[PDB]
Amino acid sequence: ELTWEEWEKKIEEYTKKIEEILK
Amino acid sequence: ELTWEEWEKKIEEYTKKIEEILK
Amino acid sequence: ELTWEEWEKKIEEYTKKIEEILK
Amino acid sequence: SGIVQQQNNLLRAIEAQQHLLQLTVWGIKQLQARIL
Amino acid sequence: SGIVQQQNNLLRAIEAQQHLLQLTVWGIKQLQARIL
Amino acid sequence: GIVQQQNNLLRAIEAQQHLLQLTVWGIKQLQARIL
């Protein structure tokens, strides 16, 4: 099962990735 | 207003639409 | 840090902005 | 295929994701009301 | 007007959807902390 | 160009779909805990 800690890390990863694409 | 069952079914329906586009 | 009231307002503000863009 | 078709596909995907985002808003509000 | 304008509108839409999505993440974290 | 920008849009949408998988997952976790 996914932990809330890894959940939070993956959220940050995909959000950062989109922010870099949109720049 | 939605039941949680209807909520889950609509999540699946919109996912199917999106994945068909992404494929 | 947000209050839940402020959260609800910003949700609606971004929803209206998106809907306007998507027309 | 072409850019025009692909633009339409991207638009439809973003519109469907907007529905998903609205559904997640509903679920959070449901749980918030239950908890708080 | 043209593809250039329509593509720019899609970019603005996803930018705004990312703000909306970040707000849902905040709400989930708040409720997670309350519950667990 | 438009071709490159269209590809960047697709990649953003794919990442936004992964984010939605994650927020849906989190809501389901809390819903099952509460109800």
Author numbering:
A (entry chain H), B (entry chain I), C (entry chain G): 114 to 136
D (entry chain D), E (entry chain E): 35 to 70
F (entry chain F): 36 to 70
Sentences from the paper on this structure:
As anticipated, HP23L and N36 formed a typical 6-HB structure similar to many other gp41 core structures. In highlight, three N36 helices formed an interior, trimeric coiled coil with three conserved, hydrophobic grooves, and three HP23L inhibitor helices packed into each of the grooves in an antiparallel manner. First, three hydrophobic residues from the PBD of HP23L (Trp-117, Trp-120, and Ile-124) inserted into the deep pocket of N36 trimer and made extensive hydrophobic contacts with the pocket-forming residues. Importantly, Leu-115 and Thr-116 at the upstream of the PBD adopted a hook-like (designated as L-T hook) structure similar to the M-T hook structure observed in other crystal structures, such as MT-C34, MT-SFT and MT-SC22EK. Also importantly, the Oε1 atom of the side chain of Glu-119 accepted a strong hydrogen bond from the backbone NH group of Thr-116 (distance = 2.9 Å, angle = 167.99°), which further stabilized the conformation of L-T hook structure and strengthened hydrophobic binding of the upstream Leu-115 with the hydrophobic pocket on the NHR trimer.
Entry of HIV-1 into target cells involves the binding of the trimeric viral envelope glycoprotein (Env), which comprises the surface subunit gp120 and the transmembrane subunit gp41, to the cell receptor CD4 and chemokine coreceptor CCR5 or CXCR4, which triggers a barrage of conformational changes in Env complexes that activate the activity of gp41. Then, three C-terminal heptad repeats (CHR) fold antiparalelly onto the trimeric coiled coil of the N-terminal heptad repeats (NHR) to adopt a thermostable six-helix bundle (6-HB) structure, which drives the viral and cellular membranes merger eventually leading to the occurrence of fusion. Peptides derived from the CHR or NHR regions of gp41 have potent anti-HIV activity by competitive binding to the counterpart (NHR or CHR) thus preventing the formation of viral 6-HB structure. Thus, we determined the crystal structures of HP23L and LP-11 bound to a target-mimic NHR peptide with the wild-type sequence or resistant mutations.
